[PDB]
Symmetry: T
Subunit: 68 residues, 12 copies
Amino acid sequence: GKVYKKVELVGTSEEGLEAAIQAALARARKTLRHLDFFEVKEIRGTIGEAGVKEYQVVLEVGFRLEET
Amino acid sequence: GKVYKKVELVGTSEEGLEAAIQAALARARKTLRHLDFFEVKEIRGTIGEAGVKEYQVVLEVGFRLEE
Amino acid sequence: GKVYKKVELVGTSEEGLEAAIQAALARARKTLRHLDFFEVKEIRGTIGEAGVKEYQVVLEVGFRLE
Amino acid sequence: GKVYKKVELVGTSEEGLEAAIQAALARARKTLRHLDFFEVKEIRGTIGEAGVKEYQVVLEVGFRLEE
Amino acid sequence: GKVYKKVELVGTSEEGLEAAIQAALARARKTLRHLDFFEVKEIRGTIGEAGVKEYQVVLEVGFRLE
Amino acid sequence: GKVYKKVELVGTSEEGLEAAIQAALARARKTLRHLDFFEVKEIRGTIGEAGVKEYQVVLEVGFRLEE
Amino acid sequence: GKVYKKVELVGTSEEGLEAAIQAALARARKTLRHLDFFEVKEIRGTIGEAGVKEYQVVLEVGFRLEET
Amino acid sequence: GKVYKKVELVGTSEEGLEAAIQAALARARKTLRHLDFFEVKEIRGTIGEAGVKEYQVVLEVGFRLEE
Amino acid sequence: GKVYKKVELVGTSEEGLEAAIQAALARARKTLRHLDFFEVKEIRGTIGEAGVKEYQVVLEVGFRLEE
Amino acid sequence: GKVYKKVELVGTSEEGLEAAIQAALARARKTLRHLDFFEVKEIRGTIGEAGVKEYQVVLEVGFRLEE
Amino acid sequence: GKVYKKVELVGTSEEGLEAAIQAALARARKTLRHLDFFEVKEIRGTIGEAGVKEYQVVLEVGFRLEE
Amino acid sequence: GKVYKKVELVGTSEEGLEAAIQAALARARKTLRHLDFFEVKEIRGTIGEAGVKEYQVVLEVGFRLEE
Ligand SMILES: CC(C)(COP(=O)(O)OP(=O)(O)OC[C@H]1O[C@@H](n2cnc3c(N)ncnc32)[C@H](O)[C@@H]1OP(=O)(O)O)[C@@H](O)C(=O)NCCC(=O)NCCS
Ligand SMILES: CC(C)(COP(=O)(O)OP(=O)(O)OC[C@H]1O[C@@H](n2cnc3c(N)ncnc32)[C@H](O)[C@@H]1OP(=O)(O)O)[C@@H](O)C(=O)NCCC(=O)NCCS
Ligand SMILES: CC(C)(COP(=O)(O)OP(=O)(O)OC[C@H]1O[C@@H](n2cnc3c(N)ncnc32)[C@H](O)[C@@H]1OP(=O)(O)O)[C@@H](O)C(=O)NCCC(=O)NCCS
Ligand SMILES: CC(C)(COP(=O)(O)OP(=O)(O)OC[C@H]1O[C@@H](n2cnc3c(N)ncnc32)[C@H](O)[C@@H]1OP(=O)(O)O)[C@@H](O)C(=O)NCCC(=O)NCCS
Ligand SMILES: CC(C)(COP(=O)(O)OP(=O)(O)OC[C@H]1O[C@@H](n2cnc3c(N)ncnc32)[C@H](O)[C@@H]1OP(=O)(O)O)[C@@H](O)C(=O)NCCC(=O)NCCS
Ligand SMILES: CC(C)(COP(=O)(O)OP(=O)(O)OC[C@H]1O[C@@H](n2cnc3c(N)ncnc32)[C@H](O)[C@@H]1OP(=O)(O)O)[C@@H](O)C(=O)NCCC(=O)NCCS
Ligand SMILES: CC(C)(COP(=O)(O)OP(=O)(O)OC[C@H]1O[C@@H](n2cnc3c(N)ncnc32)[C@H](O)[C@@H]1OP(=O)(O)O)[C@@H](O)C(=O)NCCC(=O)NCCS
Ligand SMILES: CC(C)(COP(=O)(O)OP(=O)(O)OC[C@H]1O[C@@H](n2cnc3c(N)ncnc32)[C@H](O)[C@@H]1OP(=O)(O)O)[C@@H](O)C(=O)NCCC(=O)NCCS
Ligand SMILES: CC(C)(COP(=O)(O)OP(=O)(O)OC[C@H]1O[C@@H](n2cnc3c(N)ncnc32)[C@H](O)[C@@H]1OP(=O)(O)O)[C@@H](O)C(=O)NCCC(=O)NCCS
Ligand SMILES: CC(C)(COP(=O)(O)OP(=O)(O)OC[C@H]1O[C@@H](n2cnc3c(N)ncnc32)[C@H](O)[C@@H]1OP(=O)(O)O)[C@@H](O)C(=O)NCCC(=O)NCCS
Ligand SMILES: CC(C)(COP(=O)(O)OP(=O)(O)OC[C@H]1O[C@@H](n2cnc3c(N)ncnc32)[C@H](O)[C@@H]1OP(=O)(O)O)[C@H](O)C(=O)NCCC(=O)NCCS
Ligand SMILES: CC(C)(COP(=O)(O)OP(=O)(O)OC[C@H]1O[C@@H](n2cnc3c(N)ncnc32)[C@H](O)[C@@H]1OP(=O)(O)O)[C@H](O)C(=O)NCCC(=O)NCCS
Ligand SMILES: Cc1cc2nc3c(=O)[nH]c(=O)nc-3n(C[C@H](O)[C@H](O)[C@H](O)COP(=O)(O)O)c2cc1C
Ligand SMILES: Cc1cc2nc3c(=O)[nH]c(=O)nc-3n(C[C@H](O)[C@H](O)[C@H](O)COP(=O)(O)O)c2cc1C
Ligand SMILES: [Cl-]
Ligand code: NA
């Protein structure tokens, strides 16, 4: 019928969760076409002297494979 | 004695995660009483030309059954 | 080699998820040294008249043991 | 063929686990027909001065949709 | 934005897995508007003389709340 | 060294959870030796006239293999 | 009360999913009595020239232990 | 605002499930204040000549942190 | 010494479940060699006029890496 | 077509992980034919004076049924 | 009855998996009494010039609470 | 900020678990730059005349994406 591929990316940001998700998808958009959906798998991060240093969101990203 | 019900909702927002959760709870508040707690089950969404198009937060919402 | 301990905390905030996470880490920082990493286990909360009353983020917090 | 619905209920009791389960089903019985099976999803509770204050059993309850 | 509700149904059939899924959705459409998607949660069933007696497919069904 | 075998049993009882567990273990004891440990995998059951009809505890039972 | 035993089988078939499930239950009934319920744990398989080579359905099968 | 901590305890009892849970909570309150909620993570145990020897209930216990 | 790669694909089809799986594998076969095994991760789909519109099978596909 | 059975074994060893897995398989080999594959479900063990006393590897072991 | 506590440690080693487990238990042994059992939760690590740089084993360690 | 990709590899070895892990990473470093971390997802394998024929370690390998 149709075929999609999913790739597992980790987006990171010092700002917040949305920014980390957006960083992953902004990079995905540079090389992948027909990006349709995503699913958050994990939220983790690193700690520094101010609390969160880096948010890291592990994301599956689904895109439709071109037939032609 | 007391009994609670949980319903599975999906709140959506183009703005962010908190807004998505709030959308679901805003809608629940119009028809349901004694809403007590929620649990996020998953965070999903759609992708558009500018990154995230829609955040979709799947929530379970618990409320006390009256009477 | 090195050994880390993980403790399960729940940070709360009326304003958002990042704020809830930061609350947990801010409290951890008062008594724990060599805080390194965190993992969100669950997002929960309470409901009030204006929707979300409290965001409650269940976190694992990893720190290096001296 | 036949179709069932499952509803997620939380039964509570200050007495025990069985009593919390029975509280959920006792309430379900007041308004739902053809209740058939249940599955425990979670056992939770609250703590008080004397230990457990309330047992809280999260249950999936299945009933056959009639006609 | 939009809000969706998910309901957990179990479709059954003696014919097969597809028929089981269709039974739940056929019943769902008799009362629910704006049905959009489904997610299979598990496949179970009963055993008889001939092998499978009936297939039972536990489904979550999403629809938009109007 | 030692090797253990785990087998999955379901005990049932109309009385309670402990009774269901004990039923599975009583049966295991009739034919197996060196029964050491158990792990509850799920709690399910049936619904009758007065709430719970049958408690059904799915149990993994571990025993040390002889030789 | 009653006691059931569950066993984990893998039914295989080149035809389809139902056929793989049926293969397990058919073998089960050759030696086991009072077979009552099954639960699919996973659907796996092998790949060949024509796509799916073999469907492999991992199944839990429950039967009532006889008392006499 | 508030910060809570969860500890994983295993309550045990030769009597039953509720007793194992209560045993964990009774010990917790000897030293911990602001004990609020618990969540059962698993039910395990040992087997003896009469079936269950000891029930072992793995429990997360949540309490509010002071200061 | 030898190494395999797994890739997560979603096959879709309006016919049925097997057709969805075969769709993903047929495509994989056009550009990948040494395809060996698959594992179904989930079954999802869309709803239309007459019940199921599209079956969507999420599949991991494992293949041997050359050299 | 072919039918396989999977049994859950716990291999143990005071030396290491691979030794514990090999212990389970060495035992399986004494009474079962067409042993094909294994799946590690869990790594557990006991603690002694010098750290690990015994490794205990919970394995599923699959074999093809004859006839 | 008795009450146990479980703590989650991450043992690390450049050598191997058993070494990482042992590093965690060695540190546990310095300050904790009645260490009884462990459960491996995760195996992960870092990558360097020669492949694995450090193995990291996330472990639950159970000990009996004294007194 | 930075973006990483995770790929699922299966490393194999007749020697042991660490060798299987190292086989996957050895292959990875021939074609991928900025390899950072790994997570073991599953330990599987095959059985032969002498017990374990082949250890197969299913690994997620994470690497930083360029530019
Ligand atoms: C290294 C890597 C991260 C780089 O990804 P990238 O920046 O997107 O670079 P790519 O070369 O993959 O570019 C995207 C390709 O997808 C194609 N493409 C984009 N969208 C597509 C779609 N919807 N359908 C089909 N093709 C599409 C592009 O045309 C391009 O191919 P082309 O250069 O032939 O035109 C990625 O290639 C990768 O993860 N490879 C797998 C590595 C691996 O697992 N190695 C084994 C280690 S042991
Ligand atoms: C009660 C509790 C929440 C208080 O935590 P706290 O606010 O961090 O206070 P603590 O006394 O633990 O202070 C932190 C300690 O860790 C030490 N420490 C901080 N970082 C460390 C590190 N990286 N490595 C080693 N030690 C460290 C501090 O020096 C301090 O010890 P000290 O007072 O001897 O100098 C916490 O101790 C706890 O959860 N314990 C409960 C135990 C339990 O589960 N009880 C059993 C019930 S059945
Ligand atoms: C009993 C039950 C299975 C019957 O379901 P049903 O056949 O669909 O019958 P319902 O009336 O509930 O469903 C149709 C309703 O949904 C409404 N509806 C349909 N699609 C809708 C949509 N997309 N958005 C909003 N409402 C919608 C219909 O208008 C109708 O409501 P109305 O009578 O006010 O007009 C169902 O009501 C149920 O599972 N609820 C039981 C509640 C429960 O859990 N009991 C508590 C036990 S303790
Ligand atoms: C509010 C609520 C807790 C009340 O539950 P309740 O006490 O069972 O009340 P119900 O109206 O569902 O009563 C049971 C209904 O199911 C019907 N019914 C009972 N058993 C049935 C069966 N086996 N098959 C079909 N219908 C059945 C009854 O006829 C009755 O409907 P009717 O009065 O229209 O004839 C429950 O309906 C609910 O959880 N719905 C909330 C919907 C929701 O999720 N809100 C959206 C928020 S965004
Ligand atoms: C059918 C079944 C439930 C009957 O169970 P049961 O009542 O315990 O009867 P068993 O024949 O297994 O008897 C237990 C045997 O194990 C022996 N045994 C008891 N404890 C033991 C131990 N710790 N170590 C080794 N052997 C032991 C007993 O002495 C007896 O052997 P024996 O009769 O040769 O003396 C059980 O054998 C079973 O589930 N078999 C698997 C069937 C199956 O999967 N079929 C495939 C269908 S596709
Ligand atoms: C060993 C252990 C079980 C003893 O538990 P315990 O009997 O409850 O002892 P604690 O020191 O934690 O006692 C509770 C302390 O927290 C305080 N406290 C109690 N409730 C509190 C709360 N809600 N908020 C903050 N502090 C609290 C008590 O006043 C007491 O402090 P005090 O010593 O000043 O009187 C426990 O400390 C433990 O599990 N420690 C972790 C061990 C570990 O992981 N070590 C590293 C191994 S590598
Ligand atoms: C876009 C995409 C789906 C296209 O896949 P495709 O149609 O199979 O095309 P690919 O080039 O990737 O795959 C075929 C290649 O694999 C090779 N190949 C096939 N089987 C192989 C095997 N067993 N071992 C090694 N290589 C093999 C083929 O020879 C071909 O390479 P070549 O052109 O150099 O000869 C795929 O490249 C992809 O998903 N890339 C990842 C994108 C990504 O994650 N980017 C990062 C975004 S942030
Ligand atoms: C007790 C037990 C551990 C002993 O196992 P064992 O040492 O391998 O001995 P078994 O007799 O069971 O198995 C060996 C037999 O399997 C047969 N066998 C071996 N490989 C086979 C294959 N691939 N296909 C079919 N049969 C095979 C052999 O013929 C052999 O001898 P047989 O001719 O007498 O049947 C095991 O039988 C068991 O766990 N039984 C289940 C007990 C149970 O669950 N009881 C219910 C308690 S409530
Ligand atoms: C900081 C930390 C790693 C240090 O661990 P440590 O090196 O093992 O030192 P601890 O004090 O925790 O543990 C040793 C204590 O437990 C006692 N103890 C050891 N084994 C015991 C057992 N089986 N039963 C009861 N007590 C025991 C020791 O006697 C000692 O207490 P003492 O000083 O009164 O003699 C640990 O205390 C910890 O993780 N604390 C929790 C901090 C926390 O979560 N704070 C909240 C931040 S928001
Ligand atoms: C076939 C496959 C296993 C071969 O992997 P491989 O041996 O690593 O070969 P690649 O072609 O991917 O080589 C690595 C590429 O990534 C680039 N790369 C390496 N590290 C990188 C990094 N950190 N960031 C960006 N790019 C990187 C390399 O420069 C090289 O690209 P180049 O040839 O343009 O220089 C792999 O490409 C694959 O699994 N493809 C996906 C197949 C697929 O899903 N097809 C769809 C089937 S329906
Ligand atoms: C379509 C649907 C979502 C509409 O939800 P809704 O917008 O909340 O509309 P409702 O009719 O359920 O309104 C809420 C009801 O719950 C009642 N209610 C609110 N809070 C309550 C509480 N805490 N305790 C008991 N009842 C409560 C309200 O009084 C109202 O009932 P009333 O009209 O008798 O006064 C629908 O309720 C639903 O999803 N039900 C199940 C549909 C289903 O699964 N059908 C089977 C298909 S196969
Ligand atoms: C090899 C094996 C697959 C053969 O299975 P099988 O073809 O069904 O052969 P069995 O010998 O088990 O025959 C079924 C038995 O269950 C009995 N049985 C069938 N249904 C029953 C039921 N409902 N209640 C009680 N007993 C029943 C049959 O009568 C027969 O026993 P009997 O020969 O004493 O009359 C075997 O059953 C097995 O998997 N055993 C476990 C092997 C094992 O784990 N060994 C340890 C390895 S380290
Ligand atoms: C991790 C992994 C999982 C596998 N799962 C299955 C399986 O589900 N069913 C099956 O028949 N074979 C399975 N196999 C075996 C492969 O399909 C294949 O036959 C074997 O790896 C030999 O492949 P090769 O000739 O490409 O090296 C699996 C192999 C690996 C490494
Ligand atoms: C459900 C299942 C899982 C399997 N998993 C693996 C695997 O983990 N690794 C592997 O190399 N082969 C795997 N296989 C392949 C078997 O090891 C075996 O080689 C194959 O089933 C051929 O079986 P037979 O020779 O007994 O007929 C798997 C097969 C099945 C049916
Ligand atoms: Cl068996
Ligand atoms: Na032991």
